[PDB]
């Protein structure tokens, strides 16, 4: 059971033929050795006549087109990024200056010094 099982059921429904769900022996997808020039896996099963049709996630490449044929891709995909879910991490000392400002605290301190200097210049210049 799974996705490709129901996909093969839909193919047999819209095409009208008996099927036989078989398992590949070595568990390999498909490869051609440079020495033997022999395709293995389900590719070798289709080339050497061991199988009739393969309904499985096999990557359509150019080197596989040279021996067998491929239909239009039913499921498009690509390369994605697997990261973990961002949970809460311990912020620590950075929580003292975390909200509302990263640089404006120094502006508050500078305005504090400025208001202090102006208040001293007003309060200590009357004579």
């Amino acid at each position: 059971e799974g996705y490709c099982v129901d996909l093969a059921a839909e193919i047999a429904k819209h095409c009208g033929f008996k099927y036989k769900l078989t398992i590949v022996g070595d568990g390999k997808y498909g490869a051609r050795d440079a020495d033997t020039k022999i395709w293995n896996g389900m590719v070798g099963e289709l080339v050497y006549g061991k199988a009739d049709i393969a309904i499985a996630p096999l990557t359509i490449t150019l080197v596989r087109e040279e021996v067998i044929d491929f239909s239009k891709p039913f499921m498009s995909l690509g390369i994605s990024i697997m990261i973990k879910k961002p949970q809460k991490s311990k912020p620590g000392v950075f929580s003292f200056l975390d909200p509302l400002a990263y640089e404006i605290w120094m502006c508050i301190v500078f305005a504090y010094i400025g208001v202090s200097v102006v208040l001293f210049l007003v309060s200590r210049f009357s004579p």
Binding site: T59, I79, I81, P86, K88, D98, P99, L100
Partner: protein, 49 residues
């Protein structure tokens, strides 16, 4: 008000968003599988990223 806003929602976000985020930093590592066409895609690529 802003500290109540932080303590209210607490919607943490992800640091990595795009594919250029991997090249933009070096602290968070990233890897692929040791064998397969995925590593061959990066080995045969011509994009400088």
């Amino acid at each position: 008000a802003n500290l109540a806003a932080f303590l209210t929602v607490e919607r943490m976000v992800s640091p990595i968003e795009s594919a250029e985020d991997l090249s933009k930093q070096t602290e968070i590592a990233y890897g692929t599988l040791d064998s397969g066409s995925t590593k061959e895609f990066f080995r045969r690529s011509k994009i400088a990223v």
